[PDB]
Amino acid sequence: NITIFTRILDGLLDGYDNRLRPGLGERITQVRTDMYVNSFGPVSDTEMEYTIDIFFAQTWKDERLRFKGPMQRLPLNNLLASKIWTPDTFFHNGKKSFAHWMTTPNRMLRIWNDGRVLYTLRLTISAECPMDLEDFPMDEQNCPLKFGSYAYPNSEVVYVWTNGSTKSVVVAEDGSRLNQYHLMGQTVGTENISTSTGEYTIMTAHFHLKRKIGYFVIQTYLPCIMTVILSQVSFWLNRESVAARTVFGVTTVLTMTTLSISARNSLPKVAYATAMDWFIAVCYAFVFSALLEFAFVNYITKSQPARAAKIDKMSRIVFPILFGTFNLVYWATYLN
Amino acid sequence: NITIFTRILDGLLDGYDNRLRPGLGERITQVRTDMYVNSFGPVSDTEMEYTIDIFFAQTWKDERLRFKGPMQRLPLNNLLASKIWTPDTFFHNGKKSFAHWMTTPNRMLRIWNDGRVLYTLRLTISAECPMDLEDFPMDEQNCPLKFGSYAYPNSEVVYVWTNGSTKSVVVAEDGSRLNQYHLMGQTVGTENISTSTGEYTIMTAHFHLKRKIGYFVIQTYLPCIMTVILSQVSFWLNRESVAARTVFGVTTVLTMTTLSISARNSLPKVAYATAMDWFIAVCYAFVFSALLEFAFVNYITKSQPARAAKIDKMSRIVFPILFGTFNLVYWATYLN
Amino acid sequence: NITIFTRILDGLLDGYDNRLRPGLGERITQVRTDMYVNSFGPVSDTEMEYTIDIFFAQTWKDERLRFKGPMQRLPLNNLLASKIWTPDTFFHNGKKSFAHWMTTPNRMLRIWNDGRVLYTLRLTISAECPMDLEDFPMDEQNCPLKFGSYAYPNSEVVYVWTNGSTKSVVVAEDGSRLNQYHLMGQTVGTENISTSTGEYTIMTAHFHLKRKIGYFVIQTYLPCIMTVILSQVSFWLNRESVAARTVFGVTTVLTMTTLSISARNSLPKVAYATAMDWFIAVCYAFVFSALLEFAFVNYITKSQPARAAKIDKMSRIVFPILFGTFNLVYWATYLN
Amino acid sequence: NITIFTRILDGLLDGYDNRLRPGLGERITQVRTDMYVNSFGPVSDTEMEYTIDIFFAQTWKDERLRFKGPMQRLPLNNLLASKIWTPDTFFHNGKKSFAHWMTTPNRMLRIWNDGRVLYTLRLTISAECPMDLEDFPMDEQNCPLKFGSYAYPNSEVVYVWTNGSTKSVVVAEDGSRLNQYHLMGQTVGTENISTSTGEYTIMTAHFHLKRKIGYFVIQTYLPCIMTVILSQVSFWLNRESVAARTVFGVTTVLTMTTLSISARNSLPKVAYATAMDWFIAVCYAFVFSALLEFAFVNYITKSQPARAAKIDKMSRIVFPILFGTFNLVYWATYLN
Amino acid sequence: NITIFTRILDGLLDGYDNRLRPGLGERITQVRTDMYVNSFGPVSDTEMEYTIDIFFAQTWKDERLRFKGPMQRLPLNNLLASKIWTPDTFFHNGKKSFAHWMTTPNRMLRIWNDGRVLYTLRLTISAECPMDLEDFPMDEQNCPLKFGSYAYPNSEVVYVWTNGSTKSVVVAEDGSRLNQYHLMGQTVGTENISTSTGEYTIMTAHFHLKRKIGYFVIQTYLPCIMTVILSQVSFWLNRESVAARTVFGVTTVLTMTTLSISARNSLPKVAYATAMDWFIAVCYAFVFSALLEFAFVNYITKSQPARAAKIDKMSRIVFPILFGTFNLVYWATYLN
Ligand SMILES: CCOC(=O)c1ncn2c1CN(C)C(=O)c1cc(N=[N+]=[N-])ccc1-2
Ligand SMILES: CCOC(=O)c1ncn2c1CN(C)C(=O)c1cc(N=[N+]=[N-])ccc1-2
Ligand SMILES: CCOC(=O)c1ncn2c1CN(C)C(=O)c1cc(N=[N+]=[N-])ccc1-2
Ligand SMILES: CCOC(=O)c1ncn2c1CN(C)C(=O)c1cc(N=[N+]=[N-])ccc1-2
Ligand SMILES: CCOC(=O)c1ncn2c1CN(C)C(=O)c1cc(N=[N+]=[N-])ccc1-2
Ligand SMILES: *[C@@H]1O[C@H](CO)[C@@H](O)[C@H](O)[C@H]1NC(C)=O
Ligand SMILES: *[C@@H]1O[C@H](CO)[C@@H](O)[C@H](O)[C@H]1NC(C)=O
Ligand SMILES: *[C@@H]1O[C@H](CO)[C@@H](O)[C@H](O)[C@H]1NC(C)=O
Ligand SMILES: *[C@@H]1O[C@H](CO)[C@@H](O)[C@H](O)[C@H]1NC(C)=O
Ligand SMILES: *[C@@H]1O[C@H](CO)[C@@H](O)[C@H](O)[C@H]1NC(C)=O
């Protein structure tokens, strides 16, 4: 009962040319594609790339593979994949993509009586995701995934998503786990690109990313906020304690200087100011301004002591108010 | 006496199709799997992955390989593995798995008279282990290992553990050696997952990990604890020594600030607070509060000196007590 | 209607030797090359290399592939590429180049009736780009890309750009995105190099890079500029406050020392001074000079107090003026 | 005179099955193994692995390769290695081993008239070397190297070292060069391991490593030793100089805190205390104790000045003596 | 006119055994080798290795390839390389060598009428270069490059440089570009090594490297030199300013401590003192000695004030002189 299957496979491969697409010179080969994202790998902001592991499935019609037998389907493995024609699908934005080979090349091939072919493959794509880090860390990113035929233009091979967008792309519940991003959702679309080699239909999948704040709050904002509060303590010390207040201003100013350097070490070396940079810059101004207030106060503490005391007393109220007011504007401006 | 073995191998391969599973169209192929963990590689918390080296063994029945001869078994090597049918087993959560090829592809194939086939393979699997670092470093992790057929659904190929759970998975005594984890034990199970390509039986092995503390005690807790004690020394200095006590508060506050930054550099950039973060935050409050006490004491040291001395004297007792009390609650809360 | 294509391919490969170039012993094989830069990868200054992803296309004439049929063109894939002769093009300056294999080897082959052959390939070239970092960060770089035949000298195979320079090399709008460089434009050229193995025509493409400033302003210049301003605040403090002014000078001098070390950590370990180094050196002189002024002032504050006050008062004006004057000369000198 | 060699090779391969070991069903195949360590690569303490490059040679007897000819030996290359049977030797503890392929696969095959076969191979083995870092840096390590057959149990293939232990394993004079280890010597042995797949003879080579001190002396011990001496200088300052002595204690205590953090960055994250950790801990106690002495002295400098001076004077002698005494015990305890 | 070439290639391969070296059993195969260094890659001091990209050319005589035809030479590509015999040349000290495969395997094969064969190959060799860093950074290194036959002893295959040493090895003008080394020149030689597998002729090429100073001057020496000068400023302050002079000594001593740690981070972890270490150690003594002078001066400032002033005044002259004198001896000793 098993020899029958062997004959069917031999018959289909008899006189079959894998170098020619099905329907050549007769029609346009239509390929239906569906994707299942097993795991949405890490998003490297420094390299502007993200890693994704998917089960890429392609379906098409091949009349040369029609057969008759007791079983309506022929489950198979990677062995027969090379013997038949498969689309030369490639990822336009994929910088480096490699397949999984252990324990066996993770490929499946299924053939029906009518000649319909299902060919799914497991891939780990490392694509490029350009980002505009102007609102960082309150930034949203849209990482795309573009793929299509490499050699067959739109007039020969056409890719279309199967069913609706929701069914076309599926993300596992545990797969969408990132340390500094929320996977809000996914969208799909199609487009035609005109090239010197001809028109090619492009299948694009966009992943919406919402950066999750809380790591930078514990890493950058809080040390900056507490450092500013530390500087304001100097206003509560006597003017004659010149050395004591000097330590506050000098240490706080340098503390903010190193925080700015440390903060940008993890951030990509982008040549523009981000939202976090402005927050640090303002905090640096507050600590620096406090030192200037002491220097000005200590400069006139002898000629006009009366005004020096008033400035020091007033600074105890103005500085906390302005810093608190700035945060409300800053957080409300970006958290909206 | 050696030519007989050659004839047997030629006969079995004569008319044998490796593209068809044994028992096709007649029964369901049953595969018995056993695992031996040679070494439980490092667990990368930053990348949420772990590396494991195993001797993956699969056993199944193939009537096409039945033979008669003086020897009841036919030990072999990787040469004949490709000539026969083998299950397309793959690791669902395996991000990157590679085989060992030196000196020779580490594969063994054994065939008995009845047709039973033993096919073991050495692998180095780099799987993903999601972790909830809310109780870090007093956290327990359960890293799984899922594998199954890629192309053959549950109706064609079924995986079952051999004998009990203990015999199914074995870990070498020297293999289970990690720098920051204890391998408490292992558990195995089976489940069926419904997919668009059909139902597939999933074989899962869970490794229980108990993070071992002591590195963070020497790295984070002790510097934080001693820094807090250092700040409390300021309470034993005279109020008029404004500069001396200012150095204590400023240096200690900044010392805790850098410790928080340094501590999280090794920790994954998770957007939530861990148990260690709370300990650092409380320690930061103690050192910061001590500086505020001096500022308040130095602010009223002239108008009401009597109360200033009492506060300074009282702080010498309250601060050590509260810090010690906090540790007992903190350690008892998590070490239980 | 599909069997006709199979016969044509069989006929062309019948009696075809892929080890012999077309026109051997009769003429010189002319290859027309065009390039499309999908993405201009990162430029590693430390390793003096850059990564580029391109669609490398080669066109040549092969009379052995002439055919007659209803279709004037024969779109194909990588399968037939190995069966025919292709140029042994290689990148002379390419340190490490790898092809893309997923989902299918990204190669296309097209053949016309006259025998013209189009063979395009996707590549990721990691070439070496020597740089003279004397005006860093106000430096312009010209990273080349040289390629040609490895085995066929100029007398056998010749490479020529197709159409003009603009059409020969094309860069995608989104591809030319670098964190610290502007892709001003591209230029192409040809040359002959004499070697022991014969003369070889070299096709060269030069990419003009204009480093974008703004990251170093936020990372190096601003901390240095503010540190210098911080030191000058000491001039506004009383001479008798010896400890207070000592903290300013010591902290600022050490702050500049660490900034110089930190700044060069990212910069390649070049054994010469850059423009940024001179800026840091001058800033170090200003902060160091301020401390010397205090030491000199504090040294004569008793013998001749009158001159000490004048020097301190005068320094409040001279130092800000010189530092501001230096910046105008420095920025104007390099920003021109 | 060269055609004779061609006939001999053809005759031996005629009717030769490479899937069957020599002497199958007649005797036990004996393999003689010798090793030459070209270079003992770096030992990664963090990853508990070491890299070694060797010339692995295996010798065995194969009666199927007997031949008669003018030349008693048949030097060859990797071409014939795949055509005959070779042992499936593998490294049990080898985490990742790769062969050398340039310029040609570095394999040699030699055959004698009697059928003796010599098959040597060049390998770069990255094995795992567990270490107990309790006496670090005064620790000795014994990195093993285990290898044997993967598919042939002890009843079919047996490995034995050739000649004595000294000749069996040889290390090049320049190969044994490590930055932080001394290669004292090598030892070899054999053992049988019982496994579910049968008994396998294991050939083990142990490399004795003696960590060389001097890098940690310049990196950790000396800064710690000088820091302690720096703290003791405070005892020679007047009590009334409260700020001056406070700077000594605060700076020294924090200096030791960062040294402990910095020292363990290179060290593996082991969850136990090493010898260096105890040395740092004691040094931290000395600097911390000195600050406590000043605080206690400054606390009673008014009520009982007489005792305060005596304590300060006495501390100038006790502290240097105890620190010196501790070092003699510490160094003698571990350097013995 | 092209079919003639096809017949010649078929005739040569007819009855040709690639497993036998030319002249086997009749003479000794002589191989002439020439090298062209396209680029001398980076020299990794930490890993004691260097990377080099070369065009490795080998020439030998093979009477089996003699042919008669209109063309005196047969330019070819990698296709025919595997069909004929080529030497099994390998690099003895090569830790990891890989070939270039894009766009086509960069191999050339040329055959003349007499049977002379030219076979050149492009390689990227990562060899090991042991270094004695005793005079670092004033150290000279001699990185070798050893290669020879793997399977054919000196009695079968012999390697000889072609023409003189200068022509045998050539380095491109732009190839010899290193960030911290000068390529003074190259030398070549030959030697015979006796091994258990027989005598093998070794072809060695030595590259003379002269480390270029200037990065460490800007990174290590200058901060150390200026730090020492900073400490000497304390001698110009009044003795009663105890806190002011304490800050100078404490900050400078700790500044030198961190510089020593930072400097050795890039340097390999060698267990011996380098020239830079001695310079840092002396600088540490000067800053430390200055603090001791203040402590001694402040200790006797009351009992014998007259001597205290003289010591402080004298130290202003002695310390600068000794430090300047040391540099002249240090620089002259190593820069000679
Ligand atoms: C420079 C001459 O062209 C080429 O060498 C070439 N080679 C491939 N391709 C091209 C053309 N091009 C720039 C492509 O972006 C390209 C896009 C496609 N669509 N998809 N998915 C499919 C193929 C494409
Ligand atoms: C998107 C269409 O599907 C695919 O392309 C596909 N390709 C493989 N597989 C699938 C289906 N799927 C999502 C799988 O998770 C899958 C699980 C399995 N069980 N195991 N072990 C076995 C195979 C599976
Ligand atoms: C040392 C003997 O030569 C060789 O072994 C060798 N092998 C290849 N090549 C050479 C010669 N040479 C130094 C090359 O730079 C070279 C340049 C070329 N042009 N392109 N593009 C093409 C080929 C070249
Ligand atoms: C889980 C069922 O077993 C296996 O799958 C398997 N596969 C290989 N091997 C084994 C058995 N085992 C645990 C091995 O440690 C093993 C050791 C050997 N000796 N050597 N050198 C040789 C082979 C071995
Ligand atoms: C342990 C038994 O030997 C071997 O297994 C072996 N295998 C190769 N080789 C050897 C011998 N040996 C130690 C080599 O250093 C060796 C050097 C050579 N010359 N070159 N270039 C050529 C070959 C060499
Ligand atoms: C692409 O081309 C096809 C040609 O049939 C057309 O139907 C389709 O609408 C085009 N898509 C877009 C986005 O223009
Ligand atoms: C999976 O399916 C099989 C079908 O025979 C069933 O026997 C088994 O109980 C199922 N397993 C689970 C966990 O439901
Ligand atoms: C290279 O050689 C060819 C030989 O025909 C010549 O036409 C061309 O001008 C040469 N190119 C250069 C740059 O000299
Ligand atoms: C291993 O088994 C063989 C069986 O012949 C025996 O001779 C040998 O002594 C055993 N080795 C050990 C270490 O027990
Ligand atoms: C190596 O051996 C050959 C044998 O002919 C000899 O001619 C040559 O001089 C030897 N080389 C050295 C360096 O001894």
Numbering used by the authors:
A (entry chain E), B (entry chain A), C (entry chain D), D (entry chain B), E (entry chain C): 14 to 322, 393 to 419
From the article:
α5 subunit-containing γ-aminobutyric acid type A (GABAA) receptors represent a promising drug target for neurological and neuropsychiatric disorders. γ-Aminobutyric acid type A (GABAA) receptors belong to the pentameric ligand-gated ion channel superfamily (pLGIC), and in response to the neurotransmitter GABA open an intrinsic ion channel that permits the passage of chloride ions and drives inhibitory neurotransmission in the mammalian central nervous system. In contrast, clinical modulators such as benzodiazepines that treat anxiety, muscle spasm, epilepsy and insomnia bind at the extracellular interface between the α-subunit principal face and the γ-subunit complementary face (between α1/2/3/5 and γ2) and do not induce obvious conformational changes to the pocket in structures solved so far. Instead, here we performed rational engineering to generate high-yielding, high-stability, simplified homomeric and heteromeric constructs based around the α5 subunit that could be structurally resolved by X-ray crystallography or cryo-EM.
In the case of RO154513 we included a megabody, MbF3, that binds nanodisc MSP2N2 and has been shown to dissipate preferential particle orientation. This led to a reduction in preferred ‘top views’ by α5V3 and a resolution of 2.54 Å from a 2-h data collection. Neither flumazenil nor RO154513, which is identical except for an azide at one end, interacts strongly with the loop-C T208 side chain methyl that is unique to α5, as revealed by a Thr to α1/2/3/4/6 Ser substitution in α5β3γ2 receptors only reducing affinity 2-fold for flumazenil and 3-fold reduction for RO154513. The potential of this methyl to stabilize binding will be greatest when the distal end of the type II BZD phenyl ring contains a larger functional group to draw closer to I215. Overall, the two extra methyls, one from T208, and one from I215, both contribute to the 12-fold selectivity of RO154513 and the ~30-fold selectivity of RO4938581 and L655,708. As previously observed for other ligands, the binding affinities of RO154513, RO4938581 and L655,708 are two orders of magnitude lower, being reduced by 360-fold, 96-fold and 340-fold, respectively, for α5V3 versus α5β3γ2.
